[PDB]
Amino acid sequence: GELLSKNYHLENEVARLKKLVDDLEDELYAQKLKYKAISEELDHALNDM
Amino acid sequence: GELLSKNYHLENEVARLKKLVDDLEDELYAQKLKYKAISEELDHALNDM
Ligand SMILES: [Mg+2]
Description:
Bound molecules: magnesium ion
CATH class of chain A: Mainly Alpha
Radius of gyration of chain A: 21 Å
Number of domains of chain A: 1
Subcellular location (chains A, B): Cytoplasm, Cytoskeleton
Strand content of chain A: under 5%
PDB class: contractile protein
Shape of chain A: rod-shaped
Oligomer: homodimer
Family (chains A, B): Belongs to the tropomyosin family.
Largest interface: A-B, 28 and 28 residues
Distance between the termini of chain A: 70 Å
Protein name (chains A, B): Tropomyosin alpha-1 chain
CATH architecture of chain A: Up-down Bundle
Organism (chains A, B): Oryctolagus cuniculus
Largest sheet of chain A: none
């Protein structure tokens, strides 16, 4: 019924949002690794110059 | 009745998670802007050869 169908959709939406949080945090971590990499390359292209 | 309560707390969780997601997306956007700025610094250095 209505109450239980609403419960089900809310549980799925909560799970969808938790996954999105975990995905964004992982993307933030990936980005942190990308940034140290490009930093060393900006330093290296100053030396290589 | 327990479903009204369960639904209520799931709705609050949905609302808190959406705000978390918004914050994380703003952090990620800023991190990517910071990366773009150094990528333009990088493209200068390889161009100076
Ligand atoms: Mg946003």
